[PDB]
Amino acid sequence: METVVGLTAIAVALLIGLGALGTAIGFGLLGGKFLEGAARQPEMVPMLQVKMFIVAGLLDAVTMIGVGIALFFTFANPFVGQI
Template sequence: AIAASILIGMGALGTAIGFGLLGGRFLEGAARQPEMANMLQVKLFIVAGLLDAVPMIGVGIALFFVFANPFIG
């Protein structure tokens, strides 16, 4: 149970850091080249969707290990 909670927490922490970096780089790029803001925004949403999948996969793996632990018996 402790390992599952660490798995969920680290996945969420990594995703939060990734979202912060992604948003900062988007604002920096849009400020430097305002005419590219629309293209950058599309790429921002694509990468944000991929980043959002990381904690979801972590929760799925953690729940698998909690309820159907393959390492026991």
């Protein structure tokens, strides 16, 4: 089974790497619109910061699934058992 092992390292690198890439760009877009509103209407900041956290839960949802699967493949590799 020498081909399966090591090749799963590429699978975890893609799972965490593509997740990190999307989450870093996504928060740049969401965060830029938060500061744009905050600098023009500082009175709305307490409400808009709460609205930002609602989006943050949806934005990272699939990234956190990918990170969980990558850790699972790193410490309890399911492919090795399939020979």
